[PDB]
Amino acid sequence: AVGIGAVLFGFLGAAGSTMGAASLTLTVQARQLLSGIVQQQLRLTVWGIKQLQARVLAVERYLSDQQLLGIWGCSGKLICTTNVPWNSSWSNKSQDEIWNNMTWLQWDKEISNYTDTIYYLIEKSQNQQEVNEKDLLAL
Amino acid sequence: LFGFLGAAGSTMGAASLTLTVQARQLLSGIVQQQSNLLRAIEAQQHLLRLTVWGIKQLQARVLAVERYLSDQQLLGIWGCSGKLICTTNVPWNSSWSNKSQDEIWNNMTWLQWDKEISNYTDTIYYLIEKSQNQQEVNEKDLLALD
Amino acid sequence: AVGIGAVLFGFLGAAGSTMGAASLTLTVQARQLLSGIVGIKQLQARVLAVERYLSDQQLLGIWGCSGKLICTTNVPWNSSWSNKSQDEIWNNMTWLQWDKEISNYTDTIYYLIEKSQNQQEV
Amino acid sequence: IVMTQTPLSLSVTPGQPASISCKSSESLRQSNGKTSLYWYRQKPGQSPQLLVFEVSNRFSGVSDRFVGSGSGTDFTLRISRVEAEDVGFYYCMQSKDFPLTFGGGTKVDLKR
Amino acid sequence: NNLWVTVYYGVPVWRDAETTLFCASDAKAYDTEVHNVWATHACVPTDPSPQEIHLANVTEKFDMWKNSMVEQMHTDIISLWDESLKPCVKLTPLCITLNCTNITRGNLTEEGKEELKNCSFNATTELRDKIQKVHSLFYRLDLVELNTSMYRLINCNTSAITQACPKVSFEPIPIHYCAPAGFAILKCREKEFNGTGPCKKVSTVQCTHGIKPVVSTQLLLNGSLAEGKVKIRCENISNNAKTILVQLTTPVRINCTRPSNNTRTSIRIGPGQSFYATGDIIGDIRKAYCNVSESEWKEALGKVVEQLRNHFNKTITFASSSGGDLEITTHSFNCGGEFFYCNTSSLFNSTWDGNSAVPNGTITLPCRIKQIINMWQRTGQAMYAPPIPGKIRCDSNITGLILIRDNNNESETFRPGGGDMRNNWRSELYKYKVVKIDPLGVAPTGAKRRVV
Amino acid sequence: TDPSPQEIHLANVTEKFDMWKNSMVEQMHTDIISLWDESLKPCVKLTPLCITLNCTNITRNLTEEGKEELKNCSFNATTELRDKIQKVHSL
């Protein structure tokens, strides 16, 4: 015998909301990326290996994006800012046209050809910044 | 009190002065420290059969990785990345505990605080992640204002 | 039919260039330490690939150097480790040759970087 | 969830053990792993009284004659050596999901 | 004034847990011509200097009877046993009719004729059409009548028999049990501790001590000592305490030997699968036995009865376990490969508890040997143990006891118990438990983070 | 699972499904066969029934059904001694 109490934000609940109010729920999806239902409160079964493969996959995908945050200047953060100027050949849309009007998964299908080009420029300006922060500490 | 878990038993005012002892055994001395796991791999190469003790070293490695990353993620969603004592803007709700500071910090251990507040930490963690997310949004468009 | 457009920094690439120009391509080789181009021994290959990566990330966490490529410690460079000048290091030397120069003195320097973090007392 | 019992009434001998069974439609194993079966007792003109608050365990203040058993949907209640304080109404209650239904109810009597 | 949630990483708390533990035996070179049933080679190397941190002002309830590592160990003892028998030789072509008769061998030069027999039977070979006879020797604890006479082996009614691979040792080597990262093991260093209830002197470790997986019934051979007085650990707090685990302080040496001189010859059945049989006897035939020093044992038995009265205060008498098979009854152990079965009736005929309180030399225990071993309490999966050439002698310490309590009036009969193999590792694992460190805790302080 | 599995209603999102190219069906088909073959592997191999089966229909208000779809069949089986035969019937 149970009953639904008060409700809060839930997993993927801001998918298709908008782009500016779905960025106020970034921790809700970032909490469900490493630990799933696999962790609860005799050997080499078919369901035993398939549970162990789901635990090795869930660490490899988590460390992939977590590596890529630290190569950038953005470690342990959720919204960070870079020095890479936006190029209008990637997308020409207005500032009030992607915020307050667009959602994610519509912006995802728009710039998914350009992310590999964007990712290279964030990493390149981080090498150039950390050498300069070294070479500023020689005075 | 110096030594691993030696402050278990002291009150939590004095048990929190030596937190470096725990956050070094649980960050350094877990995966980086041991090189003898790859000295047992060649001994598993000599025998041509997968043994029982080779399966248990998978399950003791995947439990060791996940226990390390599910405490660094949770410190990453919050603002407390590479430090041991951090403050937040979450006001303490007195319906979590009405108990005074002198009773908490000077007549109660950490292991007696686990058995009092554990029903409430899933509610407390929601309010630390929400206020960290509201903070970084506010310091982005403030940044873009000037 | 596949053409080839512009050319950017490849994987090793600057492995033969000098240590002043190879320290601008540090992000290229850090991407390839974990991902790879990849049934019980199918898993033990993966877990070693994860734990070779986490061993180097925990060692950077022992020091002050977590979450950055170039970091700085306050251990003085003992002039018996190598006594070469700064221009004949950063402009006349590769990383594969510097690795053979101080390969004896690697465990001595790591022991001092770790000690000077316990001597913060902050 | 419905509840049915066998029988509707007993006619026993003092000193002779008897038993009353309840039958559930859906299995009452909660996600905790513990069931939700409750054994009650209403004397006539009196407030009800718990006897067994799981499959097995007995309420604090009830003599050891009342033993409980079962798993899934089949459950019993075996009175050991029926005496003069063991007559009246016996009930089954589930608490797996709302509404919290009660059973039919037996009427344990002797033969005057 | 105002209070604020602050986060502490590195908090010294734990919860009771249940996890996977791994072996850490001592390092040893790969010998090619011998292996162990135990791996002890795929284990991680043991640390040179352990750490054992003492924990001040903490209590922790233990329970040696509801300890998860005991059941976790017992499934590994069986899995390693069944891991090293799958690439071995199946003895399916031996379950046949055996034409088996006595041995045709001034009085003390031959003693145990009536245990061995001289069997002969049609065995197969590499060529499918050729048949051959062999003349192997067999014990009478391996044969069942079919009413010289024509009769078969025991296990061919119920089970398939697999010969043990003869390049594999039966030897306990001390294995450790280490906790992974984020877990720990708590150790009650408080002596005068009855297993259950709270401990006051606890201390954390990372691995256990070296445990030898010694298979034995009725006596806890090659174990560890109690350090100060005989400790007695019972099942229940109630009067139905059937199983008693007695632990001694001084060892009692037991010399065990097999004075016959066996010769192992090999018989080839199938293409490349030789059957190692008992060939012939070179010399005398004498019965195997075990010595127990008289009075060495009798001194230690008096120390047991002195500590038994503190639980019970009735009369204390010892009986031999009469009813059962040869497996519940006897002291069954493993001596270099041979499986002995010794008769402890001359040890447990005592009648103590008149009050509190002579070396008669040694006590000779008659021992029988089997070669077909239903190893655990399970059927279907028997094992043939191959013969060993020469003369075998084992010396071992007695460190414990396993007793079954029996009800009418004032008499407490304690008979030796055995068969439940978990009791052989509750005696080693009684003072450890596994915990899960949770280093992330919150508390209010009154210091607000600076945010504009 | 201590909570039963749940369901969050997602607002304002559309999504293309395709039940004929869903790979959950091909993954489930390889698992039901895999679990099937795991169980039969420790069971008994039954090669001593590849022999001849000499038999005649069954023997016998009246039964008068199943006379032409079922029959006892006697055969020489193996014993547990691999030297003796046993005369064994079976329907």
Place this chain on the structure above:
Amino acid sequence: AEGKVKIRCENISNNAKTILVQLTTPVRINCTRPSNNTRTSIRIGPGQ
């Protein structure tokens, strides 16, 4: 089915050849074999 009977084929191109019908209310098959047959155990080897 929630509403009425749903009928699903692969592609509407006159080469479908399989139809998935999903009903709304069931049709209760009851099905049996009446016989009180027995079962004997016959040993063919070592325990088998």
Place this chain on the structure above:
Amino acid sequence: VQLVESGGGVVQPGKSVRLSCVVSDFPFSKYPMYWVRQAPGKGLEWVAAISGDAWHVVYSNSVQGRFLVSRDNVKNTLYLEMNSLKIEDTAVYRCARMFQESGPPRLDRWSGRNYYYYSGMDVWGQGTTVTVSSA
């Protein structure tokens, strides 16, 4: 423990009553309470259930939209309202208490909901009755 009731009597169809159930020496903010119903010569039923949080309340199917359960954790009381009384409600109304205290609401992280937990009985009340009549 002691569980005392009042507030029961005789009314007309289409009226409003207010039962009450005052407790003795509880924490009472930890224990969720119940209301069972026993018609004369019948078996027990279930009517309503409020939590110790006083936030989530449930009703039976037949009595939906007509009743109102509240509580006051200072006064240690139960306040059962009734509205639009039918004829078939002539029975005995007992308040009750779960045999253990439900804890706090348990937040589920995956869906962001709070969950309350309900279980059986310790102590039925004295037993007050409401009999609806015409004259």
